[PDB]
Amino acid sequence: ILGGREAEAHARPYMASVQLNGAHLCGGVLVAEQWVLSAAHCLEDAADGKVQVLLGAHSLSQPEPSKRLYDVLRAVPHPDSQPDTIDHDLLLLQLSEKATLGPAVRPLPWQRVDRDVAPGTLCDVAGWGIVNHAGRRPDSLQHVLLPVLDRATCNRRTHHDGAITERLMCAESNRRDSCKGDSGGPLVCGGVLEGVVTSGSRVCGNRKKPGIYTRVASYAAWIDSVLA
């Protein structure tokens, strides 16, 4: 997260850390007792590497009572995601066993009404990804409150040039934004999961290129089918 502050210890019990071979890879959101939502592009270059989910964490390194590592039984990427595209960039991960819920670990329901978030609305994004341009990776969870931009504005030529489809939404990126390592994480508006940080190569914090987020209500039916 660029331009944000450190988040309160475990004020977001739904936050997860998708790891590849023991290192933080992407954020994720516990959406059910044994499922985590993340970004499909996060697993692109996984290979033989092992993928695990960390729960109840604030510090990626220091031992915490609430922390627990879980292996993954199955990684279900959305059928229509592609390595060369930012559409349908969703991924579901089934934990090896139900999570042990507590004050520091609990699922967050996602929006099911397929209506856009109103521009101007401040949404919270949290993550362990890039903190600055030097590439500094933080040890603790950070977060920022960003305003939602109108798609008409976001699709302007000199902006995303009409690439933001109806399944996508934009938020500002002027000196505040989500960067590498924040992909797969949640965009919580008013306490509700409205989006997921979309994976793709982008400079962090350029006002001319607003952040792109996958609208989770646009995929409510798919999420439901996988979790059956």
Count of other CB atoms within 10 angstroms of residue 28 = 29
Supply 200's token pair.
């793709």
Tokens encoding 105: 């670990």
Token pair 């009409």 in the structure block, residue = 162
Of 69, 72, 121, 167, the residue at the interface with a copy of itself (CB under 8 A) is 121
- 134 forms part of the interface with a copy of itself (CB under 8 A): no
| Choice between 162 and 200, CB closer to ligand DFP | 200
- Tokens representing 228 are 């059956």
Distance of CA 132 to the CA centre of its chain: 18
Q: Is 152 in the site for a copy of itself (CB under 8 A)?
A: no
26 binds, among a copy of itself, ligand DFP, none (CB under 5 to 8 A by kind): ligand DFP
- Which C-beta is closer to ligand DFP: that of 104 or that of 126? 126
Among a copy of itself, ligand DFP, none, what does residue 188 contact (CB within 5–8 Å per kind)? Answer: a copy of itself
Closer residue to a copy of itself in complex, CB, 115/157: 115
183 is catalytic: yes
**Which among 17, 81, 178, 183 is annotated as catalytic?**
183
Interface with a copy of itself includes 101 (CB under 8 A)? Answer: yes
156 touches a copy of itself by CB under 8 A: no
Supply the DSSP string of the chain, one letter for each residue: -BS-EEPPTTS-TTEEEEEETTEEEEEEEEEETTEEEE-GGGGTT-TT--EEEEES-SBSSS--TT-EEEEEEEEEE-TT--TT--TT--EEEEESS----BTTB----B--S--PPPTT-EEEEEESS--STT-PPPSB-EEEEEEEEPHHHHTSTTTTTT---TTEEEE--SS-B--TT-TT-EEEETTEEEEEEPPS---TT-TTS-EEEEEGGGGHHHHHHHT-
Residue 213 in the binding site for a copy of itself (CB under 8 A)? no
Kindly tell me which of 111 and 199 has the beta carbon lying closer to ligand DFP.
199
Closest CB to a copy of itself among 11 and 73?
Answer: 11
Q: Binding residue for a copy of itself (CB under 8 A) from 171, 188, 204, 212?
A: 188
Angstrom distance (rounded) from CA 164 to CA 173: 15
Give the nearest distance from C-beta 227 to a copy of itself in angstroms.
10
> Pick the catalytic residue: 17, 24, 89, 199?
89
**Which residues contribute to the site for a copy of itself (CB under 8 A)?**
11-13, 32-33, 101-103, 106-113, 115, 118, 120-121, 188, 190-193
Indicate which residues carry an active-site annotation. 41, 89, 183
